[PDB]
Amino acid sequence: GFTAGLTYSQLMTLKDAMLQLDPNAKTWMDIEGRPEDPVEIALYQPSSGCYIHFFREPTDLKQFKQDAKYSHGIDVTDLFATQPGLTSAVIDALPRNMVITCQGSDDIRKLLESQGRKDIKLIDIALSKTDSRKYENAVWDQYKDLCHMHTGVVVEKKKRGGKEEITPHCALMDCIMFDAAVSGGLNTVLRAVLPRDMVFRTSTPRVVL
Ligand SMILES: [Mn+2]
Ligand SMILES: [Zn+2]
Numbered sequence: 001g002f003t004a005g006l007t008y009s010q011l012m013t014l015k016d017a018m019l020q021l022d023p024n025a026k027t028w029m030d031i032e033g034r035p036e037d038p039v040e041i042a043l044y045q046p047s048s049g050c051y052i053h054f055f056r057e058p059t060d061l062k063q064f065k066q067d068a069k070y071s072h073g074i075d076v077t078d079l080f081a082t083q084p085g086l087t088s089a090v091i092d093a094l095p096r097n098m099v100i101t102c103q104g105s106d107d108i109r110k111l112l113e114s115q116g117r118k119d120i121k122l123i124d125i126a127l128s129k130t131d132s133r134k135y136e137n138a139v140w141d142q143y144k145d146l147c148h149m150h151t152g153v154v155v156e157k158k159k160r161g162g163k164e165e166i167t168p169h170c171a172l173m174d175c176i177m178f179d180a181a182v183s184g185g186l187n188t189v190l191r192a193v194l195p196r197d198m199v200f201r202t203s204t205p206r207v208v209l
Contacts, residue, residue, distance in 0.1 A: 005085020
């Protein structure tokens with residue numbers, strides 16, 4: 001009967017921040033990592049420009065390393081300071097019966113189900129791969145400063161020929177670029193809902209004991 005990980009004052013700061021969301025606005029959600037073990041989560045409301053964006057340390061390092069190599073390029077060492085319990089706390093605070101839009105609803109559905117949020121309705125936009133990435137370059141160009149976490153070289157698995165590096169997948173850039181694909185364009189200021197010191201715990205020196 002408590003929210004694990006966060007103290008009450010942190011939780012209230014989070015709940016107040018989540019009230020910045022318009023409960024009825026189009027809201028995209030995207031994750032990196034499998035829904036059972038997500039490492040990056042984003043929600044985005046293009047109307048206001050509000051976005052939720054945070055990270056989580058993986059339970060399964062082996063699968064994480066595969067995903068880093070072939071999908072997201074996140075270095076696990078940059079996840080050590082993430083706030084335990086944050087994913088559950090954020091999802092708990094989403095408005096009841098909210099409608100969320102996503103590209104491929106299977107993984108979002110599983111994540112929300114695991115949090116007991118079957119009340120949330122999902123719209124699967126079902127863009128083709130090519131259509132979904134139309135604005136990929138434009139989105140990184142404009143918004144790269146919003147996520148510096150994709151540091152690793154990401155590759156395409158190939159049977160022959162040379163190495164092929166690809167642009168890493170970011171949950172936040174995904175939301176923005178999928179919305180742009182649906183809207184037929186990418187307008188030129190977004191606003192973070194969560195405080196930086198909530199997403200990452202400040203690290204300090206220690207003597208190892
Ligand atoms: Mn994604
Ligand atoms: Zn990212």
